[PDB]
Design a binder for these strands. Structure first.
Lengths: 220, 130
RNA sequence: CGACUCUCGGCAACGGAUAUCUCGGCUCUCGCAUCGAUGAAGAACGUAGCGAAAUGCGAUACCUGGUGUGAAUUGCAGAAUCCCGUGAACCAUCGAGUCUUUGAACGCAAGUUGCGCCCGAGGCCAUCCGGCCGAGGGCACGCCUGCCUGGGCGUCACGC
RNA sequence: UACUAUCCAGCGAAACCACAGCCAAGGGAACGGGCUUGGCGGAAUCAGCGGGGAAAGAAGACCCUGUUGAGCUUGACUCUA
RNA sequence: GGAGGGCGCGGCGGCCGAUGCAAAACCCGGGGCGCGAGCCCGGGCGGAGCGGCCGUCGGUGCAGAUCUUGGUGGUAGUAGCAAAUAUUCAAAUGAGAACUUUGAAGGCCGAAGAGGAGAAAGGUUCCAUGUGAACGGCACUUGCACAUGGGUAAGCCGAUCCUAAGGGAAGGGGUAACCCCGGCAGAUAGCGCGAUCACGCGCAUCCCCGAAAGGGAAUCGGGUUAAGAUUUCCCGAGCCGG
RNA sequence: AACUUUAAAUAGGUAGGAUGGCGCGGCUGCUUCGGUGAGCCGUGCCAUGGAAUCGGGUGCUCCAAGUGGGCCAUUUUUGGU
RNA sequence: GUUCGUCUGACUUGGGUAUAGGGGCGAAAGACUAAUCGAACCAUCUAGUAGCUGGUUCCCUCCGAAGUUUCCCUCAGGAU
RNA sequence: UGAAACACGGACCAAGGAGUCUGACAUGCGUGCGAGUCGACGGGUUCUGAAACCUGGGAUGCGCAAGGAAGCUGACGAGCGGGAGGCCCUCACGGGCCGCACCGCUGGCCGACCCUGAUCUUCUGUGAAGGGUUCGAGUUGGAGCACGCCUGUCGGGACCCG
RNA sequence: GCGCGACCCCAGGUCAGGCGGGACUACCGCUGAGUUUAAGCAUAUAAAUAAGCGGAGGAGAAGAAACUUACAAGGAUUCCCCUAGUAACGGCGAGCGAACCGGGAGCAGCCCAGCUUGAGAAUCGGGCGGCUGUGCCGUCCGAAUUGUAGUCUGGAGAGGCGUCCUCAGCGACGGACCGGGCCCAAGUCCCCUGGAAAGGGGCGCCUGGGAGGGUGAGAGCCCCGUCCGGCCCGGACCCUGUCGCCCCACGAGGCGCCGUCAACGAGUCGGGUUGUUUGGGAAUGCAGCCCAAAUCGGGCGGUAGACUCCGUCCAAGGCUAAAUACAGGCGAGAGACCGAUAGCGAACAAGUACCGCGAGGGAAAGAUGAAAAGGACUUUGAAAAGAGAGUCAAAGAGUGCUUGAAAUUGCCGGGAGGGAAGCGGAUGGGGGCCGGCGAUGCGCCCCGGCCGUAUGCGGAACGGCUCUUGCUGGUCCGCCGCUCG
């Protein structure tokens, strides 16, 4: 999910540098021809020059694609479902939950056709699953570093994930803009949804029709 | 970042446009929040101002001043209002710039073309609400 | 025995590192086709009220028509009709324009604001209905097509 | 004898600097300002000076080596105008 | 030299904390912890964002490199500022005068000049007025500095016009092409003169640039401002071409 | 030293057992003129037990770094004053 | 600076003009060709190569070498 | 070899500043799945450079050996010694039984190579059968493939600089 | 001579029009190195690369087989996957080295020349008039028989016969595509701190929008935007969706069947030789030169050759989207990019200043603050400045300006001492400097203070378990009663 990026591939390459050689108490590095300027790094086929290139520092090669094995991936996806049926991992990941009488949540199929966010928070409140989304509508971190100057002003904590089991890939529109939320269908579930940061046991909300489709993902 | 194939989205670009403001850019950024009485007449929360309006400082330290908008400055996007001032050392009084967001519109000159803005935006707010 | 030599702190001066900023760079990705003798790419020199520069423009010179927006421009000065308006604005659009001097650069040259030629109209007065003077713009290489005067037993007829 | 130096008022660099600066002998990268052992042991200094700092300027131009060049020569190898 | 276990920095996914009632940063012969890498905390300075922990990743840690770039010493207030024959006195002005300016005096270059001008070159430096922040390695009120203004006027002088050595379009031909020789069927392809009348007659090695020095159409005098004046200006007198 | 019948010392090799011996009885193209023999197979018997001593264990395999200029002393020794 | 070579010709010197990089020019020194000449300078190929010199960046732990064998245009280095 | 060296560099300080990244490789280690394995050229789809889904595969392996043609065509199927551990007996010491990992060794089988050549047969094919101081990255009871990381290796400017 | 037409060849500052240069990222050709590598170096490698040169477009090149193959044959061209890190080639050394098939993406097919208009150049350019005009019509000159118009293009096709089927050209209105304009939710409520509140606290609302920026400190709700929709407007336009008018037919072509034919591109084929290039090897492509054909024929078939077969296409003319490229230009979206010695040479007047005779070389340089509120005035000084003051939340922010490190410098203090020898440290002691040092502990009894168990009551989360169901064990709180502590 990462672009390739790099240092310039023609960089400080096209800089004229020719050496004095020796007969000078000046290091045997190439040197600018132009003496008649108030500065500029003194010749620049170096790794050792102000404003010159460096032989390494990136340049388009670096694979930002690592191949995944589907059988390997299948095990990881399957494991992620199981992490919601053990409460210990949910607690460990740092979900605040006052939640229901039973272990993973199964919900009625009628929360697909929910337009409003106002309705969406209300239904979650009844469950007690609104709790961690309330902890992500505040305590939202202005992230340090250069990320502020990109577009990454706020990194929002990860609360409820809702997974629908409507066949035609139907995004519940209301649930998309809730603080700390993610939205998924069964037809697009991935490891990173159920385990941001690689830490399995995110609190997830399963639709009834979603529940029996989770089988067909692709000692003990 | 967040969604959509569109022209505009870039943290640098947003800053670039609004600082140096071309005329259309100036007028939309010259939109200053209405006072509550006016909000229920024209059915909008904010409209572009004028020079023959009167505008009241709500937000700042300078709060409680009222005056007419003397000038509007493009180059560094600022507006200048009468009686919001700081005093120079000699005793000269020079206006202190205020952002149009900070200040709130007391009184309107309707005009004819500015009046058209009120009608279109009002129609806008009617459509969503009902 | 001051002092000197040395050291540190506290306050400073020096210096511009560090932190925190960034209308910028950088790299990737996407869309798009669209220069010119109909005078280009590039240059030069001018033009703003007050400008050195950058930016803009070309004797119609920091701009014009038209159009959109609908009142600013501002450092100071200024106009006040241009403000309930065929209309403010270092404005945006900019369809209609001018678009200098150069430059492929074209009358010919060019270390030359160099040296020709031609035509236009207005005025004059008839040493002629012509002479003189005016402002503007042309007059290259290249070759097609159509065109004229013809070279030449090139080829034919017809010549005396 | 002039003009300096010197001394003044003003003005004012650079080269160079691991850290510095008293000798003797000893051993030691086999010739020490420093170590070891003896002798010593002026603050603060100026004008001088050319022993020393194997002082400084210059990756010794020589000399050797590099599977490093280039100028030249030819009865080198191999091509060619 | 290998392997092992850690620490610190920057950014990213997670998670938790901290803040204008004072963040980060920086300072601290202040305390304490860890074998260390480092960490912690206080006080001072400061004024807007930041750190810890779990994953992830690097343009990731410096003492050097006859290192690169910036700053700053000792050297050192030391070498020096010594060629060109040389200054001095009084006055003026100004806060302040060996150096400015004026006089007086002494000198110097010694007309192949340290001179009056033009070339080339520079480009306003010339002159006034303002005037000492920088600069004239002293000084300074002075300046060829800085600021502000002005100034170069030609029928006759030059360029122009003209040819030289020579350069170069045009033609033919190589060279893809750039580019180079250089003319050809301008030779019964047209330029030139009569000629106004439309027609006739005559001819090449063309045609331009090329010496602001060659060669050359044509001016003198007096006056003037900051200045060269045949030259700007003006009187008077010409001279050349149309 | 480039002679040796002769001839040391210090060095050097091998062996001191169960990875062994013995009994029983199988096969062969070998080997025997001959099951005669040889080798190799099944099965049985014999432990601390094959000198000494020790093994804060040993055996085995894969893979890679550095090194690839050495220098010195006692002793032995060649060249050379 | 002094001392001094030449100073009416193979003289001196300007301007215009010609010749440009394995090329020019040379009364010939390998001299000189814009502080540049045993092959100018500039940009590019080029971030060229170099068994060789320099430097090579946080800590602690545990183990711990070798300059020897063999081959090599190899004896300043590799393979083994 | 030995640096205090009469070796070489370094006045001082701040900030830059050098084993990197990749493609293809070996080993090791981890992960998945496993006689298979490897989604992503692609197509479906989308909350949009992603993620999700899926195709036939193709690549690599699952058999080889030759230069090549090719190969009765590689299935009859193995012993022995030391072997952890277990089993059995015994109070134990030990004995016996089964024996893995692994190691060493002796065979058979296959290809290449050389001999041997039945019955048969489209007329020279055929390959039962018995062997060999030859030789192979084989069978004789497979292990890979994909992904990743360190380190090694090569191309790349390639530790940095000349 | 005069040659009507014209023949052949010249000339117009000629009639209407056209070319150069740029761009050169990417592309299509041409032409062409060496460093390097082989630890040397020539063959070879680098590389059919860099340099040199020309020319177009938004893509370009390519393009309907003289193909690939050896099959129940594939089937223009391009690109990706694979073949492939391989066949091959190579001082067989270093290295060099692709295609065919297979899969996928994308798809699209065609017209001239070469058989006859010959009842007639039916065709075209120009001038001229008119017109609703990338055109159409009338008219007249001219072009062209050394051949225009043309059936027809190898898949074929022209003749003939017999049947059906099928057509040329218009309005008007949408959509498609592109560009704009414009609109599209909600607090500026109380309190505190501060210069300011966007901050904290109290209390709210909106959310297809809690992206971002702006704004006097972390702003969903202050403004702009954002999101999701709405409403306009102008382009471009035959891509198709509507409709509506002419039915374009007895034509032409298509189909079925039949015949006579089948015209199929030359210094090209092909070959030799030479050089260049190729993995291409008795020659891969390419070129020069030399030789040189045929049409029941010709070419190809990865080892030269003859022979016999078989297979496969049909050159030597030409067009044509898509799938493919993209360090330039223009207009956008982004990144585990960089954070002023970094990033581009350039964040700022940057290809600027400056350097060089030139070719070319080429910097340094961002930050007061919310707002200039950029220090009036008084005083000293020749002035520059200083000192007061004013201003500011802060001048410990005064255009050396946010923070203001190291080095160095100054002041001063401490230690030390002016009888003494320096690696600057370690080790020991003293001074100098400074932080630390149970909240002050326990048993017992008296008063003051507060609460109450057991057991009954009343409401419950629990247990072992069983798990329909059952039995044993709960503790606790509310708080009344009854006894005590």
């Amino acid at each position: 999910k990462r672009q390739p990026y790099a240092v310039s591939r023609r960089a400080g390459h096209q800089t004229s540098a020719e050496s004095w050689g020796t007969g000078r108490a000046v290091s045997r590095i190439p040197r600018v021809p132009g003496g008649g300027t108030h500065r500029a790094g003194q010749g620049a086929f170096g790794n050792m020059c102000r404003g010159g290139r460096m032989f390494a520092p990136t340049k388009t090669w670096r694979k930002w694609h690592r191949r995944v094995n589907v059988h390997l991936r299948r095990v990881a996806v399957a494991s992620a479902l199981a992490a919601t049926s053990v409460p210990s991992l949910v607690l460990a990941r740092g979900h605040r939950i006052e939640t229901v009488p039973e272990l993973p949540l199964v919900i009625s199929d009628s929360a697909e056709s929910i337009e409003k966010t106002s309705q969406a928070i209300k239904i979650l409140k009844q469950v007690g699953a609104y709790a961690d989304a309330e902890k992500a509508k505040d305590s939202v971190g202005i992230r340090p570093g250069k990320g502020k100057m990109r577009n990454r002003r706020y990194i929002n904590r990860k609360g409820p994930l809702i997974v629908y089991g409507t066949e035609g890939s139907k995004i519940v529109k209301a649930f998309r803009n809730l603080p700390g939320v993610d939205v998924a269908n069964v037809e697009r579930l991935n490891l990173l949804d159920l385990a941001p940061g690689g830490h399995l046991g995110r609190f997830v909300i399963w639709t009834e029709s979603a529940f029996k489709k989770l089988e067909e993902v692709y000692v003990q | 970042m967040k969604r959509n194939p569109r022209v505009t989205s870039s943290r640098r670009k947003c800053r670039k446009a609004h600082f140096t403001a071309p005329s259309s850019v100036r007028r939309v950024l010259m939109s200053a929040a209405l006072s509550t009485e006016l909000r229920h007449k024209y059915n909008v929360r904010s409209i572009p101002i004028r020079k023959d309006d009167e505008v009241q400082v709500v937000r700042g330290s300078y709060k409680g001043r009222e005056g007419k908008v003397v000038q509007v400055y493009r180059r560094r996007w600022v507006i200048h209002v009468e009686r919001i001032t700081r005093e120079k050392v000699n005793g000269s009084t020079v206006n202190v710039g205020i952002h149009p967001s900070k200040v709130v519109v007391t009184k309107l000159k309707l005009d004819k073309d500015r009046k058209a803005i009120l009608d279109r935006k009002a129609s806008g707010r009617a459509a969503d609400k009902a």
